[model samples]
Target chain A: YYIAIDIGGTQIKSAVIDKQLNMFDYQQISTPDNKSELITDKVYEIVTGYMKQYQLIQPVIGISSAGVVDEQKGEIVYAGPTIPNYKGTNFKRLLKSLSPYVKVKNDVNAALLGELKLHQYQAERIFCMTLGTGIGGAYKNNQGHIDNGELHKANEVGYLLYRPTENTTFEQRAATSALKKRMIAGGFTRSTHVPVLFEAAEEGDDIAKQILNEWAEDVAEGIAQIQVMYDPGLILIGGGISEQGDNLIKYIEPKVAHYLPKDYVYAPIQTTKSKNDAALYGCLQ
Target chain B: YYIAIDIGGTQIKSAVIDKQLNMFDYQQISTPDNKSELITDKVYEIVTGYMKQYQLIQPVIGISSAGVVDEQKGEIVYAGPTIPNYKGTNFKRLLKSLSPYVKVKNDVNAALLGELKLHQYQAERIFCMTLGTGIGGAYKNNQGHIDNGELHKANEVGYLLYRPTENTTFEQRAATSALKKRMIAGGFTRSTHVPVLFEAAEEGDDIAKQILNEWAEDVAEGIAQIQVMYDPGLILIGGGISEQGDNLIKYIEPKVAHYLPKDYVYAPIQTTKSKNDAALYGCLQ
Candidate 1:
């Protein structure tokens, strides 16, 4: 079985994959201190623990992480916001010392690879936009490779210009953060129950419709910008906010058509097939 | 033999290329009415004339132009500030009807291809920054193909966020147009020698130094951001102002390192290869 690890700010995930790349056994742990030896020592303990019990372990390990990474250097350059002290640490050297045949890469890169294998065969070019509170973008061609941008702030909806007037990340307009902030700003005292605001909008709440319209417009701008740049056959939109479903595509599709250069044509927009397990599976690849 | 066409708002350029892709006969004419047939008639006549004269006429046509292009559709979307009345035209069908083989792409993309080819086999991952009145950016891979960014504003540097406090486009402080405005506002007259201010700064001109320093720092910030994100092997600086050379690099390089993620241990400040004909040659490619 191969060992695949996904490192996050709050947790470190471990999985044992068979020859077929299926996860047979899985476990999780909290990340440790960031000093190189300390981090390595803790990781070794986990790998050792897993190796002893399985006694039937494979000779390879793959690590998936966030940050501007140097695959060859096996280092994590950006300390994820929640993960403390990540820069300049040699995670790969540590892992390889424990399991010499280990391969490591930036988490999203590995995640995109894992996602692509699911839709093999027709994989010429694919764009993956991971949405959470923020957005991260990953693009992969058929070979499951990324040789250009790194820690790719590709989906950094943050850098997007707001209709050339307002200033905010693309998601700041399309996200729940916008909803929560706006509801609070709109003098809604009860912060805990904002979903009812959706009902209010459905029932003709003026503020709710305004918020939704703005959200859809923002999302449309982001999509159009992407479409004009590459004619990818598939686009995967994943994240908590993406769960809005047709309520989103319903409003955003038309706006996307409005702003994109006339030359850009419409294409299908699909929800991420992996749901939340994308990065985990990507760790396997 | 092949044909390389660089179509701009002001002119249409057609050059005949032998087997080695060298231009044999070059023709330039003011573009015609923004209609498919008219534009195609011009192109066809030129191609026919060049073919008769050189006898190396049967060639694939590679064209580059401005504006957002629907590559699959072979049409230019919106004409920007300079290229008006170019919408609703079908370039693919018209060109195909004439020669049955034409490859049309955005001009920035072509410039990137040209820059990469002209630079020998040195820089693998390269970012070409063409600094004219506007700033243009193009990213290239080791194979010399344009890995276009989903978001690249050639004439919109004024939108890049420079200071975290106010958040301005690189144009607000650094674009040639913006700089000219800033210089005038600082009391310098139009078209007055700019290098005078630099010389004055060296001789203790505080205001001059302040403005120049801010310009360099802002540039450094933009470059630093691109470097950390792309970490390209080298950067090829283009544009007319970049002709300023060491005077420019010397001012921008040091501050650049400050903004990069500390994890990058192997990157360096980049340089320009050839200033003239980079973009023109790119059009040929």
Candidate 2:
């Protein structure tokens, strides 16, 4: 058995896994403020409770947390304000007593790992992009390792410039939050939930369809760049709206083709199999 | 001594390299049409002439040609109309009788490899972007081989989208030719040559400075994406305008900084050391 924990902005999701990678007793709770102290206490409590309930011994602990993580050091190297004071928290020192084998990674990298597992580890190279509050990305190399590149600066695609003249970036223009913000500014009185907008598009709302089409084109631009730059075997897209699956692909694929040469061969793009639970599932690997 | 050949659209540059990697007898000739047949004959004639003049034995044949090359196969896998009928030409088969050791790679890849040698191949990861007839890029990974990705489509940064809405690409805005085009449109009557334009900017021409500055920003966008995605140890700029050296860096570096985070540590960007002989020099490795 293994324990996987995904630490997010608003909530903490945890799961206990049995043999054969089947997740058991998955649960979520509101994330407490002052995560520096409360995070450890909650994780220790969750692991202990799972051990007692599952009658498990020597379960592996895998942590997926928001921020730039130093996996080797088992610590967050940097974190945005979403998780205040989260950086420099050493997970290994806190969790090694629970299990000697504890692993930690950046949330996006962990989700990519989990997504790779769902594909049975067939791809020698894979790239994943998440379209959420901010666009984040990860890459799995031929050796089945996430290549962090030197100084761990790889896969920070959000900062990639979309319009250097205006000094805008991929995330500023295309992230789901950016799309939702655009929707709100477009006079949507309803909730700005992405699916709600997609539902509106499905109901033949021309404005909704136009907005999504433009956003998908933005996404396709990123996808096209990844295809040309990395030439990975597969590109997996995650984050909230990925649950839309083919509905999202219907708008994205054609625009990607528009950027590539007629004969260009590119890796297929698909929504990841593991969605919200991707970080937790990554721990099982 | 070794023979190095760089096959270009307009001319063929050849050289005999001494043990110290210095060119002994450098020469260039108009590139013949029907490159498939004339290419070998011309190279053979040049090498024979060099050997007879220098009184040397069979020399290693190294080639950098314009095409998508199968390095392992020593053949051009694909070619544009710039070099008609070049795609299927097998270098090893044609040149092995002269010297069993014959090497071939894409001209851009070869230029990058040659550039790497000048830096002593010290950087575990290096990316090269050429601002020439088109913006071309190549990457050398930690293992000292170009990670051509799954279908050998890696590092084609030109195709990357510059503006998703307009369906334009990085090369469409940032390449040397593109810069020249923009300059011509901006009423620069003196030759559309990149160096002339830079010289004009050096003479306190605001129009030239602004044009170059905006173009540098466009180049920085690609550089930022490469830094974020690959985190290479160094990024080298090559081709026509790179001869500008520090002058080019002056425009590009600060703009790259604008795209990165406050605390981000980036690989330094510089111009390639091997200029005209880059492709041929690459064959030495």
Candidate 3:
């Protein structure tokens, strides 16, 4: 059996899986704020509880974490303000008493791995982007390994395509948070009701269509940049927005083509099939 | 001894080099327009001439070429309009009669390889950009090999950061060609004399300073994107504009910092030391 954990800014999730990849005892809780020790202490409690309850011996512990992770050290090396005091939270050391086989990876990379495994996707190179509160990017190299870059800082796509005059980065303009803001500004008071917005656009509501199209343009511009920069064989989009599936692609693809040179042949962009569970299953590997 | 050749839209250069890396019989000529066969025929003539003159028995031949090169096939798979009929030009097959060993690489990748070897710079990953007629990008992977993406189209930075509204790509705004155009528009008719612009900027010419600063901002925006997306340990810039050396960095670095988040620690950017000869030395490897 394996102990799997996913640490995000808003929530912490834990689960246990057997050799057959069957999951059990899956639970989630609100993540603590401004206290690194509290997060580690909670993780330790959850891990040990599973170990005792299942009567396992030396189980492998895998972590999928938010922020800039140092996989070699099994720690968060850097993080944004959303997760205060989160940097330097060493998971390996905290779980040392549980097992020696502790492995940790950045959440976006883990999500990509899960999607690749679940879909049996094969490519020489694959790029993945998660468009949630913030956009994050990860890629599987030709060797079928996540490229962490020299400083474990590769694929921070949120920071790409920044415009100084506008004071906005790619994520600032195209993340799900940005989508929600646009929706609210466009008089969609229930901004969290994403399906409603999609439904209205489908029903030929001009204002709804206009807002969604503008947001898609922002998203497409970033994808256009990624297409040229990495030239991956395939690109997968994850996160809450991806749940829209083909609807999301329909709005974004045309805009992406517009941004690219007319003759340029770009990789196909699709939504991750596993959705939210991707990082959880990804922790298994 | 080895026969080295570099093919560009404007010029085709050939040289012979000994085991000690000493070069000889250097020659350059204007590239023929709109004739792929002429280019290949010229390359064949140059290679055979070098082999006969140096009395080399089955010498290795290396080619550094512009366009999307399929290094495995030693052919140009895609090219811009600047080099009409350039696509599908096979260097390996054309040179097969002369020797069994022939190597081909994209000019930017070749230039990067040359810089890495000459400087003996070691890094898990390194990125290189050439900012002349067009901005081209390449990177050296941890395994000390140039990473050619699935379709052999990795690091196509010239096409990155494009804005459909502006109808401009990164290269369209930041290349030396763009700099020359901007210089000419600013009433400096002697635009080819780049040093004059630099001197004027140094002498506190407000118009010269403004033009250079605007160009640097464009260059820095692309670099900022590269820094976040790739997070390479080191970045090297080549091409004619890089001749300004530290002066170029002086204008770009500050603007790059402005584009990135205040807390983000980015990779250091430097100029390639080998200049125009980088591709020649790079072919040796």
Candidate 4:
């Protein structure tokens, strides 16, 4: 049996699992913001609860976290404004008493592993991106290599300077979170529900269609740049919007194809299979 | 002993070298343009001359060629306008009679290997870029890992779209070749020598300084983007203008710093120590 935790800005999801990935007593809680010290304690409490109530014993603990995780140090190197003061939290030290071993990875990295497992992908080089509240990326190759930059900054594609001004970035311009924010900024709607906007477009709302196309173009530009940068054989897109499946691909793929020569863009871009459970599924590995 | 050749758009350089890096019968010849089939034949003729005149025999031939090389196939998979119709040249098939094995690699990848060897760089991850007549890049990690993308397209940072338009790119706007082209267009000078222009700027030429600063900013923008993309501990700058040494860094480093957070741009940027011989030295690998 094993324990898996996925820490995100909005929630902390925990699960107890067996070798075959049968889940027991899966639960989630709203993640606290700003109270950094409470985060580890909350994780410990979850494990303790599992042990007493479900008779769970000596399971490996795997954590998938939002931010720059220094896997070597087993600590959070940096977390953006979303999770203030979350840096320097040492997971190994926090979870040492709960289990014999602990493994921690960046949420995107963990999610890619889960996506790969679920799909049984055999491609030698694969690039995965999560396109939800923020943009995140991961890369893995047949050589047992994964790109974690020198400071765990390699896959921070969101920070890519897409605009001339330093303040605007790929994430700020392309992410669905940005889409919602833009919708709010433009006074297009009172509710920031992305699906409603899409539904409106389905009803022939010209403004909604125009906004979606522009945002899709922004994402396509980032993907186009990614294709040239890494040239992976497969690129998997994950996150909430990926649930839109063909709808998302229809908006994204053609724009990405528009930027490169037909022959140069060989990598097949697809929506991730694991969906919301990707990070937890990855913990199995 | 090994036969090493560095093939470029303007010249083809060859040498005979021992295990200890000693060079013998070093020579250069202008590269023939357009006649794509002549490339491998010329290589065979070079080996034949060494065999008959100097009794050099049974040497492994290592080729570093200017183009996208399918290293595993020992063939050029793609070449730009710089070497028209140069792709699809199979080196192994042509040179098989001369030796039992022949290895081919992209020129930039080879040059970076040479740069790392010359500097004795101990850093695990190193990124190298040469901003000369054209822009080229290479990467290597302590595991002796180099990222040669599928179809040999990775690290082609030149193709990165810097402007909003599909046509303008990092190379089209930032390369020394681009600088010369711009200078020529702007009536700054008819001479395209970058160092000569730098010397003029040192003499308080305002127009030259303005042009140099603008070009340096372009290069710095690419480097900053690279830092975020790979986050290597060391970024080595090569090519002819890098011969300007710290002068190049002085112009570029500050601009890169300007774009990034003070703490994010930690990689040390420096001129490559191997100079023009980098690709040849890389062949020795």
Best by TM-score: 3
Q: Pick the winner on lDDT between candidates 2 and 3.
A: 3
TM-score of 4: 0.93
* Pairs that clash in candidate 1: A65-A107, A137-A155, B157-B171, B158-B169, B158-B171, B159-B169, B160-B169
lDDT of 1 by residue, A223-274 (tens): 6555543445566676554555565557667777655434445456666655
- Reference-based lDDT, each prediction: 0.59, 0.79, 0.84, 0.79
Error of 3 at A33 (Å): 3.0
Relative to the true structure, candidate 1 reaches a TM of 0.70
**Against the true structure, whose lDDT is highest?**
3
Q: Fnat of the models, one by one?
A: 0.03, 0.63, 0.80, 0.50
Output the better candidate (3/4) by lDDT: 3
Those runs of model 2 whose alpha carbons end farther than 4 Å from true positions after fitting are A31-45, A51-59, A80-85, A93-100, A121-123, A164-167, A187-191, B18-22, B30-59, B78-100, B121-123, B164-168
| Candidate 3 true-interface contact recovery | 0.80
Which tens-of-lDDT digit does each residue in A130-193 have in candidate 2? 8776677888876667876666657877766546466667777887667988898776655688
Name the lDDT value of residue A83 in candidate 4. 71
For model 3, which pairs clash? Answer: none
lDDT of 4 by residue, B166-272 (tens): 46778888776689877777567836777778888878887788888888888887887777767788899987788889878898988887656545645899999
Q: Clash number for every model?
A: 7, 0, 0, 0
For candidate 2, the per-residue lDDT at B270 reads: 90
List model 4 lDDT by residue over A1-285, tens digit each.
788898877778888877788777788998876575577778889878877776766768888888888987779997766677888988888877777678888888988988777777766888888887678888885475776877887877776664665477788887767898777776665367888877777788777777788888888878877777777878889877788787778888888876565456457889988767888878556
Interface RMSD, every prediction, one decimal place: 8.1, 2.0, 1.3, 2.2
Top of the candidates by DockQ: 3
Which clashing pairs does model 2 show?
Answer: none
